[PDB]
Design a protein around this motif. Structure first.
Motif, PDB file in Angstrom:
ATOM      1  N   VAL A  51       8.054   4.187 -11.864  1.00 26.82           N
ATOM      2  CA  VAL A  51       7.083   3.113 -12.506  1.00 26.82           C
ATOM      3  C   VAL A  51       5.711   3.376 -11.686  1.00 26.82           C
ATOM      4  O   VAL A  51       5.648   2.925 -10.590  1.00 26.82           O
ATOM      5  CB  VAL A  51       7.386   1.863 -13.052  1.00 26.82           C
ATOM      6  N   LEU A  52       4.677   3.472 -12.597  1.00 25.84           N
ATOM      7  CA  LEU A  52       3.342   3.214 -11.759  1.00 25.84           C
ATOM      8  C   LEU A  52       2.378   2.979 -12.712  1.00 25.84           C
ATOM      9  O   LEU A  52       2.373   2.974 -13.877  1.00 25.84           O
ATOM     10  CB  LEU A  52       2.810   4.784 -10.898  1.00 25.84           C
ATOM     11  N   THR A  53       1.232   2.233 -12.458  1.00 27.23           N
ATOM     12  CA  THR A  53       0.273   1.467 -13.337  1.00 27.23           C
ATOM     13  C   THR A  53      -1.076   2.346 -13.306  1.00 27.23           C
ATOM     14  O   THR A  53      -1.305   3.168 -12.511  1.00 27.23           O
ATOM     15  CB  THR A  53      -0.133   0.242 -12.974  1.00 27.23           C
ATOM     16  N   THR A  54      -1.748   2.324 -14.324  1.00 27.29           N
ATOM     17  CA  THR A  54      -2.992   3.134 -14.542  1.00 27.29           C
ATOM     18  C   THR A  54      -4.065   2.015 -15.195  1.00 27.29           C
ATOM     19  O   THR A  54      -3.628   1.849 -16.303  1.00 27.29           O
ATOM     20  CB  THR A  54      -2.752   4.519 -15.181  1.00 27.29           C
ATOM     21  N   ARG A  70       7.300   4.864   0.158  1.00 32.28           N
ATOM     22  CA  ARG A  70       6.611   5.643   1.079  1.00 32.28           C
ATOM     23  C   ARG A  70       5.780   7.077   0.539  1.00 32.28           C
ATOM     24  O   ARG A  70       4.948   7.382   0.695  1.00 32.28           O
ATOM     25  CB  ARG A  70       7.363   5.967   2.326  1.00 32.28           C
ATOM     26  N   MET A  71       6.840   7.648  -0.459  1.00 29.38           N
ATOM     27  CA  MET A  71       6.307   9.005  -1.025  1.00 29.38           C
ATOM     28  C   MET A  71       6.574   9.017  -2.386  1.00 29.38           C
ATOM     29  O   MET A  71       7.656   8.452  -2.936  1.00 29.38           O
ATOM     30  CB  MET A  71       7.194  10.086  -0.313  1.00 29.38           C
ATOM     31  N   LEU A  72       5.885   9.323  -3.301  1.00 28.46           N
ATOM     32  CA  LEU A  72       5.962   9.497  -4.691  1.00 28.46           C
ATOM     33  C   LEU A  72       5.694  10.868  -5.227  1.00 28.46           C
ATOM     34  O   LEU A  72       4.378  11.247  -5.233  1.00 28.46           O
ATOM     35  CB  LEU A  72       4.846   8.627  -5.455  1.00 28.46           C
ATOM     36  N   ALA A  73       6.743  11.483  -5.414  1.00 29.16           N
ATOM     37  CA  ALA A  73       6.591  13.135  -5.720  1.00 29.16           C
ATOM     38  C   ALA A  73       6.383  12.930  -7.405  1.00 29.16           C
ATOM     39  O   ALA A  73       7.346  13.187  -7.978  1.00 29.16           O
ATOM     40  CB  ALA A  73       7.909  13.762  -5.401  1.00 29.16           C
ATOM     41  N   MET A  74       5.061  13.010  -7.777  1.00 28.30           N
ATOM     42  CA  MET A  74       4.728  13.342  -9.210  1.00 28.30           C
ATOM     43  C   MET A  74       4.533  14.665  -9.488  1.00 28.30           C
ATOM     44  O   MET A  74       3.697  15.428  -9.020  1.00 28.30           O
ATOM     45  CB  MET A  74       3.560  12.499  -9.342  1.00 28.30           C
ATOM     46  N   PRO A  75       5.548  15.152 -10.488  1.00 25.75           N
ATOM     47  CA  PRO A  75       5.471  16.557 -10.687  1.00 25.75           C
ATOM     48  C   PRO A  75       4.378  16.602 -11.764  1.00 25.75           C
ATOM     49  O   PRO A  75       4.544  17.439 -12.656  1.00 25.75           O
ATOM     50  CB  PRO A  75       6.923  16.648 -11.608  1.00 25.75           C
ATOM     51  N   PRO A 125       0.695  -1.169  -0.077  1.00 27.95           N
ATOM     52  CA  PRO A 125      -0.075  -0.032  -0.022  1.00 27.95           C
ATOM     53  C   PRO A 125       0.863   1.182   0.232  1.00 27.95           C
ATOM     54  O   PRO A 125       1.158   1.761   1.067  1.00 27.95           O
ATOM     55  CB  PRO A 125      -0.767  -0.157   1.192  1.00 27.95           C
ATOM     56  N   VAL A 126       1.203   1.648  -1.126  1.00 28.39           N
ATOM     57  CA  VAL A 126       2.109   3.025  -1.252  1.00 28.39           C
ATOM     58  C   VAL A 126       1.185   4.128  -1.521  1.00 28.39           C
ATOM     59  O   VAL A 126      -0.104   4.199  -1.639  1.00 28.39           O
ATOM     60  CB  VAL A 126       3.003   2.881  -2.576  1.00 28.39           C
ATOM     61  N   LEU A 127       1.575   5.285  -0.950  1.00 25.81           N
ATOM     62  CA  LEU A 127       0.771   6.580  -1.054  1.00 25.81           C
ATOM     63  C   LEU A 127       1.532   7.600  -1.844  1.00 25.81           C
ATOM     64  O   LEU A 127       2.658   7.428  -2.287  1.00 25.81           O
ATOM     65  CB  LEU A 127       1.043   7.279   0.316  1.00 25.81           C
ATOM     66  N   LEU A 128       0.840   8.207  -2.559  1.00 24.00           N
ATOM     67  CA  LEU A 128       0.965   9.289  -3.616  1.00 24.00           C
ATOM     68  C   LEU A 128       0.262  10.486  -3.444  1.00 24.00           C
ATOM     69  O   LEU A 128      -0.736  10.475  -3.299  1.00 24.00           O
ATOM     70  CB  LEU A 128       0.665   8.585  -5.056  1.00 24.00           C
ATOM     71  N   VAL A 129       1.058  11.523  -3.673  1.00 22.25           N
ATOM     72  CA  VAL A 129       0.306  12.827  -3.621  1.00 22.25           C
ATOM     73  C   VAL A 129       0.335  13.614  -4.711  1.00 22.25           C
ATOM     74  O   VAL A 129       1.313  13.521  -5.663  1.00 22.25           O
ATOM     75  CB  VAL A 129       1.367  13.819  -2.502  1.00 22.25           C
ATOM     76  N   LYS A 130      -0.875  14.358  -5.261  1.00 23.25           N
ATOM     77  CA  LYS A 130      -1.121  14.805  -6.418  1.00 23.25           C
ATOM     78  C   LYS A 130      -0.559  16.099  -6.342  1.00 23.25           C
ATOM     79  O   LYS A 130       0.164  16.733  -5.233  1.00 23.25           O
ATOM     80  CB  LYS A 130      -2.606  14.892  -6.821  1.00 23.25           C
ATOM     81  N   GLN A 131      -0.737  17.209  -7.321  1.00 13.99           N
ATOM     82  CA  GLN A 131      -0.403  18.570  -7.353  1.00 13.99           C
ATOM     83  C   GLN A 131      -1.319  19.318  -6.642  1.00 13.99           C
ATOM     84  O   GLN A 131      -1.869  20.333  -7.086  1.00 13.99           O
ATOM     85  CB  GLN A 131      -0.301  19.031  -8.795  1.00 13.99           C
ATOM     86  N   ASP A 132      -1.552  19.109  -5.340  1.00 14.68           N
ATOM     87  CA  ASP A 132      -2.354  19.852  -4.396  1.00 14.68           C
ATOM     88  C   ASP A 132      -2.079  19.574  -3.124  1.00 14.68           C
ATOM     89  O   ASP A 132      -1.744  20.402  -2.146  1.00 14.68           O
ATOM     90  CB  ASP A 132      -3.743  19.785  -4.805  1.00 14.68           C
ATOM     91  N   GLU A 185       6.157   7.179 -16.874  1.00 15.68           N
ATOM     92  CA  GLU A 185       7.387   7.725 -15.883  1.00 15.68           C
ATOM     93  C   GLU A 185       7.220   8.691 -15.130  1.00 15.68           C
ATOM     94  O   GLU A 185       6.813   9.614 -15.521  1.00 15.68           O
ATOM     95  CB  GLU A 185       8.579   7.445 -16.640  1.00 15.68           C
ATOM     96  N   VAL A 186       7.653   8.669 -13.953  1.00 16.81           N
ATOM     97  CA  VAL A 186       7.684   9.773 -12.968  1.00 16.81           C
ATOM     98  C   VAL A 186       9.215  10.152 -12.770  1.00 16.81           C
ATOM     99  O   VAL A 186      10.045   9.673 -11.961  1.00 16.81           O
ATOM    100  CB  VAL A 186       7.250   9.307 -11.666  1.00 16.81           C
TER     101      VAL A 186
END
Lengths: 45, 99, 146, 217
Positions: C102-105, A40-45, A20-27, C86-87
RNA sequence: AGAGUGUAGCUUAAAAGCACCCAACUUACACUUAGGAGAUUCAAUUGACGCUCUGA
């Protein structure tokens, strides 16, 4: 009424672990995502 | 042409010797059975709740429609039909932590 | 016999309408029956795109069981192939080194035939009230190719 | 046959945060995760730990720990958004950020001459126009702000009948997207009210039949 | 204030037959298998605790 589709299970026969990984959006909001590699943290730009 | 994606990759057959054994006990099995029974009962209760709420909403809508028909023999022709507005409708899911 | 009162008792094809047509490539969708006092929309296309696959599958199963228990005909429900993304990750003290993740959708599609005004609005309000965490709804049209 | 033309406008707000979790659901999630672990096989982390430790032992008799430590450090440093929002105020009931777990319905208090109750914001329609148009016009005029009230359909919700000259009430709902309410210090008694507060505030029978079609969750 | 009423969601059934959900197969629906929760509101054909309608 958001817990009816929360307790899920992978119905496939052959699959790897989905931590169960966590991801934060652009907000600024986290979300439990079942994905490999216990990150633990996924920094998606 | 739809591309199939549920096909498992080729890296799912060469390795399969890690955790083949599964050890449990009678207490664990009976606890899991009790939990599954409780969850089934809870799901049945939620289903009955949703059914009665949907029935109440449907009967309220029917009462409103019949009252509008008996009180106005003209507004029903413009209230029953739907105008083109919900074609690009979208609703994003809820969140966990506020921004 | 034709003259006996028991004529036409073994008839059975008149009670069925499945003529075994080619439904694999037929693109004949039902139009929105508009009349004023009786509104009936054609076939829609519900989209449940998210980052997790099991959540989307569970939501599709739930909505399919719901539309099966609500006495409404269902066309066909399929799934589109996933799209890998890709991120990029930039280094802290170095604004020139970039990494990748890598992440799925995934995404599911369900269709319903008969949607009267009251029934469709009740269905959509029930869907949005019981909308789980993670997935998102975006209903489109039936002319969405793959 | 005189008929007084009235209406109603009920607001629908989608929730932001989810409802709290019960212990039985926690145990169910735990057992489902255990079943997932027992069914899963050959993972990336499992290999990158096991074969790496094996190679370490082999080349010592002649990664992963630091990575998970950095992961835990990044998780502890990053503080998520505080979900505690319905308990730190306990006074600003007319705010948008009051309740974010359930649905909220807006109502405005208006004291008339013969009637002195808390009626839902009605909507007067004219025969020269339609009904949903007049409803959305009244909703835009009584809100004095920039909001997006996406109606879920042209069909109504619930109707009533009160006479003294006949009258009728037409209920209409609309989904709210974002909340850009200008000047929250107006003298209008517009308070974001959920379900239990809605059932506790009303008194007569004309409002008791509204909580039967709203999303009770 | 008056009327219609009275077995779980249904019975020109007298404690049953239809319904619902969960676990296994399925992209999905669905059959099947393995299980679960359900009722004659009270005192002897009578009167009153629940719902609806007609009102104020």
């Amino acid at each position: 009424d958001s817990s009816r589709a929360s307790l899920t299970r992978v119905h496939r026969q052959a699959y790897a672990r989905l931590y169960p990984v966590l991801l934060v959006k652009q907000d600024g909001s986290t979300i439990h995502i079942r994905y490999r590699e216990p990150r633990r943290m996924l920094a998606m730009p | 042409i739809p591309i199939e994606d549920f096909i498992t990759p080729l890296k799912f057959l060469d390795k399969a010797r890690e955790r083949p054994q599964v050890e449990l006990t009678f207490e664990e099995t009976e606890r899991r059975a009790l939990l599954l029974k409780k969850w089934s009962l809870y799901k049945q209760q939620e289903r009955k709740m949703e059914r009665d709420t949907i029935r109440a909403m449907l009967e309220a809508q029917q009462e409103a429609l019949e009252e509008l028909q008996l009180e106005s023999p003209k507004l029903h022709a413009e209230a029953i039909k739907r105008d083109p507005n919900l074609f690009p409708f979208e609703k994003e899911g809820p969140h966990y932590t506020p921004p | 016999y034709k003259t006996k009162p028991t004529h036409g008792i073994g008839k059975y094809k008149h009670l069925i309408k499945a003529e075994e047509p080619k439904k694999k490539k037929g693109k004949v969708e039902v139009r929105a029956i508009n009349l004023g006092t009786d509104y009936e929309y054609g076939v829609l296309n519900i989209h449940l795109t998210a980052y997790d696959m099991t959540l989307a599958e569970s939501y599709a199963q739930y909505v399919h069981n719901l539309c099966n228990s609500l006495s409404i005909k269902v066309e066909e429900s399929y799934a589109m192939p996933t799209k890998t993304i890709e991120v990029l990750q930039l280094q802290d003290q170095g604004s020139k080194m970039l990494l990748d993740s890598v992440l799925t959708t995934h995404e599911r599609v369900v269709q319903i035939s008969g949607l009267s005004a009251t029934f469709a609005e009740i269905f959509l309000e029930i869907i949005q009230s019981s909308l789980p965490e993670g997935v998102r709804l975006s209903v489109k049209e039936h002319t969405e190719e793959d | 046959s005189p008929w007084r033309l009235l209406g109603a406008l009920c607001l629908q707000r989608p929730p932001v945060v989810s409802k709290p979790l019960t212990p039985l659901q926690e145990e169910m999630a735990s057992l489902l995760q255990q079943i997932e672990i027992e069914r899963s096989l050959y993972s990336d982390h499992e290999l990158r730990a096991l074969d790496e430790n094996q190679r370490l032992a082999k080349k010592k008799a002649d990664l992963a720990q630091d990575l998970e430590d950095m992961w835990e450090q990044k998780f502890l440093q990053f503080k998520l958004g505080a979900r505690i929002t319905e308990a730190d105020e306990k006074n600003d009931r007319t705010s948008l950020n009051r309740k974010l777990d359930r649905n909220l319905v807006l109502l405005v208090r208006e004291k008339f001459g013969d009637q002195d109750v808390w009626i839902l914001p009605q909507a007067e329609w004219q025969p020269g126009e339609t009904l949903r148009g007049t409803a959305e016009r009244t909703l835009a005029t009584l809100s004095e702000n920039n909001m997006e009230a996406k109606f879920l359909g042209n069909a109504p919700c619930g109707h009533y009948t009160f006479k003294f000259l006949g009258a009728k009430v037409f209920f209409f709902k609309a989904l709210l997207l974002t909340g850009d309410f200008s000047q929250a210090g107006n003298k209008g008694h517009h308070v974001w009210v959920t379900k239990d507060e809605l059932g506790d505030y009303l008194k007569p029978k004309y409002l008791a039949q509204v909580r039967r079609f709203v999303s009770d969750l």
